[PDB]
Amino acid sequence: PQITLWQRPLVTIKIGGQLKEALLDTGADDTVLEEMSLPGRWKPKMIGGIGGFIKVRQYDQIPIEICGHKAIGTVLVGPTPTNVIGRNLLTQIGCTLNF
Amino acid sequence: PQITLWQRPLVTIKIGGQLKEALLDTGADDTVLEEMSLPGRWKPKMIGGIGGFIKVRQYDQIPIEICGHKAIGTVLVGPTPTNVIGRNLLTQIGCTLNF
Ligand SMILES: C=CCNC(=O)[C@@H](NC(=O)[C@@](O)(CCCN(Cc1ccc(-c2cccs2)cc1)NC(=O)[C@@H](NC(=O)OC)C(C)(C)C)Cc1ccc(CC=C)cc1)C(C)C
Numbered sequence: 225p226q227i228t229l230w231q232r233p234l235v236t237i238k239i240g241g242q243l244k245e246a247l248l249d250t251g252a253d254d255t256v257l258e259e260m261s262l263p264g265r266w267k268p269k270m271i272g273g274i275g276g277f278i279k280v281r282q283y284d285q286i287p288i289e290i291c292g293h294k295a296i297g298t299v300l301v302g303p304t305p306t307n308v309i310g311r312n313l314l315t316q317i318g319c320t321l322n323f
Numbered sequence: 324p325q326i327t328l329w330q331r332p333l334v335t336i337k338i339g340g341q342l343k344e345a346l347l348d349t350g351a352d353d354t355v356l357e358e359m360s361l362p363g364r365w366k367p368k369m370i371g372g373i374g375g376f377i378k379v380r381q382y383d384q385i386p387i388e389i390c391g392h393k394a395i396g397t398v399l400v401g402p403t404p405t406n407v408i409g410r411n412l413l414t415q416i417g418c419t420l421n422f
């Protein structure tokens with residue numbers, strides 16, 4: 225698709241068999257989702273946003289569908305204001321910025 | 324141009340007579356720049372993201388040039404850890420996400 229930016233670029237994702245809404249965020253290196261359950265072991269990560277730093281749980285090699293496009297990669301879980309899909313997965317689904 | 328998301332999408336902007344580097348950020352409602360002087364009226368604003376909120380000064384009707392594209396809009400100035408171009412100016416230069 226081509227998505228304009230007059231509104232927030234919110235899309236539906238699917239992860240662990242469940243649908244969620246998430247923001248396509250080119251300003252984020254990483255993908256971070258609100259508290260949820262994921263399989264396997266996690267590692268610690270600190271990520272920085274406009275307000276400072278938070279600790280999140282890093283899960284690797286997680287299948288996730290984004291607007292129907294299949295990806296498998298690293299998903300961080302922690303206290304984010306919204307689910308955000310960052311460049312690590314935007315690249316997997318072939319996303320570019322164009323003007 | 325077409326901009327890849329393998330790396331952070333950084334561009335040069337011209338604003339208030341100054342050249343600055345900024346991040347094209349589809350996850351940001353607003354454009355936020357590190358401390359700088361701008362002309363005209365302003366009002367205080369709190370903006371939030373991962374890590375919490377910071378206080379900024381809101382200036383309206385500010386001319387900016389982004390990759391040779393001229394636009395005008397609201398610019399927030401404060402203690403942001405990085406300069407971000409938000410949707411309010413991305414729209415004006417006809418920036419879209421594509422995949
Ligand atoms: C005010 C109205 C609503 N709010 C916003 O629109 C705000 N947007 C936003 O905060 C976002 O667009 C994020 C902006 C991009 N941000 C910039 C950034 C980059 C590096 C640093 C650091 C460098 C060195 C030390 S720190 C700090 C900040 N990057 C990140 O945060 C990513 N960090 C990262 O990549 O590591 C380098 C992260 C996501 C943590 C992985 C997302 C968003 C969050 C919350 C809501 C609430 C919506 C209901 C919407 C969208 C602001 C900006 C208008």
Ligand SMILES: [Cl-]
Pocket residue numbers: 296297298312313
């Ligand atoms: Cl990844």
Ligand SMILES: [Cl-]
Pocket residue numbers: 395396397411412
């Ligand atoms: Cl504006």
Ligand SMILES: [Cl-]
Pocket residue numbers: 228417
């Ligand atoms: Cl348009």
